[PDB]
Amino acid sequence: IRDLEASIARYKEEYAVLISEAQAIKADLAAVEAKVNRSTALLKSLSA
């Protein structure tokens, strides 16, 4: 039980770090999607 609890707590810590970098990735993807839509409109006008 003690080993299971320690492994669970280590899993909580590493899973929180994984969540942290996961929404870091998600915020990066949202920012990229917005800036790519803006740049796609900008570059289509600039090519035309």
Binding site: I1, L4, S7, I8, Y11
Partner: peptide, 11 residues
């Protein structure tokens, strides 16, 4: 976690 919870409930 599901396996660990099931094992804890069994024991």
């Amino acid at each position: 976690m599901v396996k660990d919870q099931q094992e804890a409930e069994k024991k």
